[PDB]
Every structure is written in structure tokens, then in C-alpha cells.
Amino acid sequence: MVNPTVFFDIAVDGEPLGRVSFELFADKVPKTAENFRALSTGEKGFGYKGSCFHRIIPGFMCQGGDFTRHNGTGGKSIYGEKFEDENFILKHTGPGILSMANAGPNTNGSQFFICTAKTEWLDGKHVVFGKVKEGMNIVEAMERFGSRNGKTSKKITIADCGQLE
Amino acid sequence: XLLVXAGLVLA
């Protein structure tokens, strides 16, 4: 199977910023990739469209995916409230890595993070499932609205999202 | 510290 590609159209306080696209490594983690892909298209009736990045820490990562509570307490997977860590084949190699947020072993929902650095200390605890293809400069622009404690100075939103192929 | 958690954010 060819690895799927998804896009996010990012807005700052409602104003278009740019497009970010991701390669999803379905050849390593098909269950995790599929979940992100489906929440990106909205085909299940719910997903990332209109959600925000509630937690951005400069030099570290941008966290999003909480489309039910918008603060880190919510979100759900296409498989149910949670699913297992599929595997840890892939590592946090550097900027652009797309990886699952969680609340301990086997608690994957819909929350994810895009790294803006190598985050090796997270290897084996967070399932890496993708990487930024185009629009790393958009991610870098998003990053600048974050702070040390994660709070954003402006509303960073996924105005639109879906699948390219 | 620098974690990416969902609910109880730790140091």
C-alpha cells in the first residue's frame, strides 16, 4: 500500500496562514495512520476540521487533535475512546515528525503533536506515525504563537483538512 | 519537563 498524504489548512485568529501536508507511515503503523487519515477527512462524521492547537511550546512541538474538548482532556479515535500503542518501530528523529499524544501506555485517541526538534526522550512511549512533507515553514510560524507553558497568544486553528492521495 | 500528555500534564 502507498502511504497516504493529508493536509491541514492553518488559520491564525481566523486569518489563513498556510497549508501543512503530512506523509503517514501506514507501512509501519497502519492502524495509527488510518485513524489520523480518517479524522482528517471527517468521513466518520467527526474529526480535526475546526479544531485548534491548544498547546504549543517553542523549540519543542505543536499539540492538537482535541476536537471534543479543545484543551487536552478530549478527543476520540475512529476505533473508540482509546486504542493500543501499535508499535514503536519509528523514532523521534527531528523537526516535522508526527507522533501520538497520550495519557500513558495504550491510551491513543486523536491527539497528536508535530515536533519542531528531535525529541529522543519520547522514543518508546509515543507512537511516531508520520512526518511533515510540505509546509514546515507554516509549522515554524505556528510555533511563534506558543509559550513556555504551552498557552497560545492567538487561536491556531485547522480551518480545513483532508486527503491529497 | 517536556511531555506530550492528554489530561494530566506533567513537568
Author numbering:
A (entry chain A): 1 to 165
B (entry chain B): 1 to 11
The authors write:
The structures of CypA complexed with E-ISA247 and Z-­ISA247 were determined at 2.2 and 2.3 Å resolution, respectively, with excellent quality of the electron density. We conclude that the chemical modifications of the ISA247 isomers at residue 1 do not induce major re­arrangements of the CypA side chains in the drug–CypA complex and that functional differences between the two ISA247 isomers result from the structural difference at the modified MePmt1 residue only. We have determined the binding affinities of E-ISA247, Z-­ISA247 and CsA to its pharmacological binding partner CypA using fluorescence spectroscopy. While E-MePmt1 and MeBmt1 demonstrate high van der Waals complementarity with CypA, Z-MePmt leaves a gap between the protein and Z-ISA247. This is reflected in the distances of the CypA Ala103 carbonyl groups to the MeBmt1 (4.0 Å), E-MePmt1 (3.5 Å) and Z-MePmt (5.0 Å) CZ atoms in the respective structures. We suggest that lack of surface complementarity between CypA and Z-MePmt is the reason for the reduced affinity of the CsA analogue Z-­ISA247.
Cyclosporin A (CsA) is a cyclic undecapeptide fungal metabolite that is used for the prevention of acute rejection in solid-organ transplantation and in the treatment of psoriasis. CsA binds to CypA and this heterodimeric complex binds to and inhibits calcineurin, inducing immunosuppression. Here, we report the X-ray crystal structures of the CsA analogues E-­ISA247 (voclosporin) and Z-ISA247 bound to CypA. In both complexes, the structure of CypA, the backbone con­formation of the ISA247 isomers and the nonsubstituted ISA247 side chains 2–11 are essentially the same as in the structure of the CypA–CsA complex.
